Amino acid sequence: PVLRSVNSREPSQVIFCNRSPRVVLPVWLNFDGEPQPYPTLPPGTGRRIHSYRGHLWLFRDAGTHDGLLVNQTELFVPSLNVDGQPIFANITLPVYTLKERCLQVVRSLVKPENYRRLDIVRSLYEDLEDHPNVQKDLERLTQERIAHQRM
Template identity: 40%
Template structure:
């Protein structure tokens, strides 16, 4: 049976240095997961912008689109665990957009174009209306990933 690494910071023993580079076309919010697994915002990174960070090997990071909470990837991973930098070199971490499903893309576009109060007026299945009012929630996503 495979043991999972808990989605929280474990210790601050081994320091490492990273630079997060936002390669997506959207503002990216950087979230550090604290020692209880709670997300702590480290601010937004503009498209093509950077965030330099002194962090530790057991400190996980996640990234979301600032405007809508959609997932972003860090070095192609949903959760980024820093690696050891050799010779105190800074490790480059690329923040990119994943390939969203057609459904996810449509939900994002409709949320952007239709006011929340008008969603019930749409002639679409109730299940889709429910999905439209249920916006991404990082804390809930982390709970699911930890279970």
């Protein structure tokens, strides 16, 4: 699997900084590429945590699983701690598309049994039903990594 944590021996102190209004779910990809949920971060909170150089991290909304940014990108990889100093991982909201932002609002106000009762275009029902998840984005981020590695 392209997206996985390498069997790193180098320990890395990270500052997980939640600069977002969402409860953050930190996601560690293990050595097989499998997503592992870590303790959640309330909005405006920071945790000093122990990780490893070359380990893979993803950040999601803990209640909805919406994708989040970390240092302006989707994947977080701890680097070298210059003179013990920790690595700063700034977790923010991405600039969601207006369509995605809208889907998040409708999902938060309507229970799934009532999606089909909304006066919207037939296709938008399937868009509401297609909830964000780590695994869907893992496939897309795999292709982007391969394309980068090839160039």
